[PDB]
Amino acid sequence: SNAMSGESARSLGKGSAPPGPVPEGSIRIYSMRFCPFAERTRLVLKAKGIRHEVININLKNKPEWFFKKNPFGLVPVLENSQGQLIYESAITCEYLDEAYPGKKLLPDDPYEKACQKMILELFSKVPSLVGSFIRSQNKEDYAGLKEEFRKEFTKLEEVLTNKKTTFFGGNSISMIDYLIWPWFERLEAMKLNECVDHTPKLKLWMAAMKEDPTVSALLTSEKDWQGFLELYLQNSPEACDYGL
Amino acid sequence: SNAMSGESARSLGKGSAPPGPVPEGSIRIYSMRFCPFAERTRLVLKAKGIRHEVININLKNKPEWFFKKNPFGLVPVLENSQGQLIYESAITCEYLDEAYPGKKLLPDDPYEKACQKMILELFSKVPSLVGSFIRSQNKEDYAGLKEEFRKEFTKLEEVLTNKKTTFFGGNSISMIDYLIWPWFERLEAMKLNECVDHTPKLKLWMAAMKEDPTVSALLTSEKDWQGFLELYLQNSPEACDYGL
Ligand SMILES: *CCC(=O)N(Cc1cc(C)no1)c1nc(-c2ccccc2)cs1
Ligand SMILES: *CCC(=O)N(Cc1cc(C)no1)c1nc(-c2ccccc2)cs1
Numbered sequence: 001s002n003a004m005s006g007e008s009a010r011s012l013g014k015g016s017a018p019p020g021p022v023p024e025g026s027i028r029i030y031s032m033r034f035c036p037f038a039e040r041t042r043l044v045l046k047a048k049g050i051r052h053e054v055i056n057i058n059l060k061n062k063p064e065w066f067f068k069k070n071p072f073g074l075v076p077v078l079e080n081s082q083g084q085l086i087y088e089s090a091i092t093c094e095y096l097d098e099a100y101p102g103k104k105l106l107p108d109d110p111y112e113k114a115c116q117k118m119i120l121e122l123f124s125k126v127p128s129l130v131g132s133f134i135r136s137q138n139k140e141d142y143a144g145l146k147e148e149f150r151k152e153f154t155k156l157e158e159v160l161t162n163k164k165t166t167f168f169g170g171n172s173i174s175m176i177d178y179l180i181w182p183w184f185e186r187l188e189a190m191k192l193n194e195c196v197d198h199t200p201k202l203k204l205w206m207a208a209m210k211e212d213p214t215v216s217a218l219l220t221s222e223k224d225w226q227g228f229l230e231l232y233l234q235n236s237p238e239a240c241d242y243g244l
Numbered sequence: 245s246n247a248m249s250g251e252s253a254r255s256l257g258k259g260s261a262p263p264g265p266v267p268e269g270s271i272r273i274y275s276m277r278f279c280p281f282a283e284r285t286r287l288v289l290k291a292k293g294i295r296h297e298v299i300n301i302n303l304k305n306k307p308e309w310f311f312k313k314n315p316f317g318l319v320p321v322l323e324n325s326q327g328q329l330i331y332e333s334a335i336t337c338e339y340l341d342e343a344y345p346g347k348k349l350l351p352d353d354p355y356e357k358a359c360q361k362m363i364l365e366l367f368s369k370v371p372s373l374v375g376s377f378i379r380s381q382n383k384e385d386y387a388g389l390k391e392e393f394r395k396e397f398t399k400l401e402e403v404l405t406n407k408k409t410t411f412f413g414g415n416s417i418s419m420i421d422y423l424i425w426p427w428f429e430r431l432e433a434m435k436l437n438e439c440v441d442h443t444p445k446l447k448l449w450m451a452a453m454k455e456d457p458t459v460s461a462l463l464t465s466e467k468d469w470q471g472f473l474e475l476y477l478q479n480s481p482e483a484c485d486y487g488l
Contacts, residue, residue: 071366071399072365084355086355086358086362087362087365088361088362088365091358091361091362091365094357094358094361095354095355095357095358098354098357099354099355110338110339110342110343111328111330111339111343113339113342114330114335114336114338114339117332117335118330118331118332118335121316121332121335122315155315
C-alpha cells in the first residue's frame with residue numbers, strides 16, 4: 001500500500017536532535033501515527049491538498065525540544081516556514097481551513113459554524129469513554145462502558161435524525177465529520193461494532209465516511225493499531241513505531 | 245447604580261414560566277448573575293453594543309424547560325428571533341463577534357485568531373483550580389492550591405512577556421481578555437491578590453482591565469459575590485438571587 005501521510009516515518013525520541021527549519025511553501029505537522037487527535041489535522045491537510053511534512057513524536061519517550069513546540073508536549077503541532085506554532089487539534093484544523101485555499105471545510109455562516117462546534121461538544125465524552133474502555137481491567141466495567149457508548153452514540157444519532165442528512169454538516173462531508181471520524185474508525189478494532197446497533201443514521205454515516213477519498217487514503221491496519229495499544233498500555237517506547 | 249446587564253432580573257426556577265418570544269432585532273442571553281462563563285458572553289454583548297435581553301436561570305432550582313434551550317442545562321445560551329439556539333460560552337462569544345457589527349474583538353489574521361484560542365487553552369486549568377480552592381477544608385491544601393495558582397499565572401505571564409503587549413491579543417483589549425477576565429475579577433474577593441504579585445505584567449493587565457469601560461459597566465459588589473458563593477456551595481435555591 002501507498003504511505004500518503006507520515007505512515008513510514010520513525011518517531012523521534014529522547015536524545016534526538018531538533019529538526020531543521022520548515023522549507024518555504026511547506027507546513028510541518030508534529031504527529032504520532034496512531035493518535036486520533038493528530039489524525040484530525042492529517043485529515044484536514046489532505047482534504048484541502050496542503051503541501052506538508054510529518055515529524056512523528058515518540059509519546060512514551062518524548063524529546064525535551066518537543067516541549068518548546070508545545071509546552072503541553074502533545075501532538076498535533078503545526079509549524080510553518082515563519083516558525084509560527086499552532087497546537088490543539090481543533091485550533092490546528094480551523095487555522096488550516098482559514099489560512100489555505102481549496103475546499104472550505106467549515107461553513108462561513110456564523111450560526112452554521114456554531115452548530116458544528118456545538119456538535120463537537122456533544123461528541124466530547126466519546127474520547128474519554130474510549131480511554132476508560134481500553135484500560136478496563138474487568139469484564140463487568142467493560143460491558144457497562146459498551147452501554148455508555150450506546151447512550152453517547154444515540155445523542156449523535158438524534159443530530160442526524162433532526163438535520164435529515166447523511167453527514168453532520170449536511171449532504172457533503174465537512175469539518176465536523178473529519179473531527180469525529182478518528183474515534184469511529186477504530187470501533188471495529190475495539191470490538192464496539194454492537195454499539196452502533198440502535199443508531200441506523202450513525203451506521204450509514206460510518207459507511208459513507210469509509211468511502212471518502214481523504215478518509216480511505218489514511219486507513220491503516222487494525223492489527224498495527226491493536227499491537228500499538230498493547231505496547232502503549234505497557235508504557236513502551238516501541239509503541240509509536242509498531243509495524244515499521 | 246444603573247443595571248445594564250441583567251443585574252436586577254430575578255432568576256427563573258421550577259414553577260416559573262419560560263420567557264416570551266425574542267423581539268426581532270434583539271437577542272436573548274440565558275445567564276446567571278454570578279456565573280463567570282455567562283459573564284464572558286455578557287461582556288461581548290456590551291463591548292459590541294448589541295441590543296439584548298438577559299434572562300437569569302436559578303441554577304440550584306433549574307426549570308426542566310431550560311433543557312430544551314441547552315441539553316447540557318448550562319448557561320450561557322443565546323436565543324434569537326428566528327428561534328436559533330447557541331450554547332458553550334466560547335461558542336456564544338465567537339458567534340457574536342462574527343454575526344454583529346460594532347467593535348471587532350477577534351483579529352482578522354488566522355494565526356492571531358489561533359493564538360487567542362491557544363492562550364484560552366493555557367488558562368483552562370484556572371476555573372477548575374478556582375472550584376477546588378472555594379471547596380478547601382484544610383490549611384495544607386489551601387497553601388498547595390495557591391502554589392498551583394502561582395504556576396498557572398506564570399504560564400500567562402510568559403505570554404505577556406513574549407508578546408511585549410499590555411493585553412493578551414495586543415496593545416488593545418480583545419476577545420481573549422474578556423474570556424479570562426471573569427476569574428481574575430474575583431481574586432480580591434477570594435483573597436488571592438498575592439498570587440499575582442510574582443507576575444508583574446499579569447498584575448498590570450488586571451489594573452488595565454479594571455479601567456476598561458465594558459468591564460466597569462458589569463462591576464458588582466464583592467460582598468454580593470461572596471454571599472452568593474456561601475449559598476451556592478450549600479446548594480441553596482436562593483443563591484442565584486442574593487442581593488435582589
Ligand atoms: C495524540 C494523543 C495520543 O496519542 N494518546 C494520548 C492520550 C489521549 C488520551 C485520551 N489519553 O492519552 C493516546 N492515548 C491512547 C490511549 C488512551 C487511554 C488509554 C490507553 C490509550 C491512545 S493514543
Ligand atoms: C454558569 C456556571 C456556574 O454558575 N457555575 C458552575 C460551575 C462551573 C465550574 C467550573 N464549577 O461550577 C458556578 N459554579 C460556582 C462554584 C462551584 C464550585 C466551587 C466554586 C464555585 C460558582 S458559579
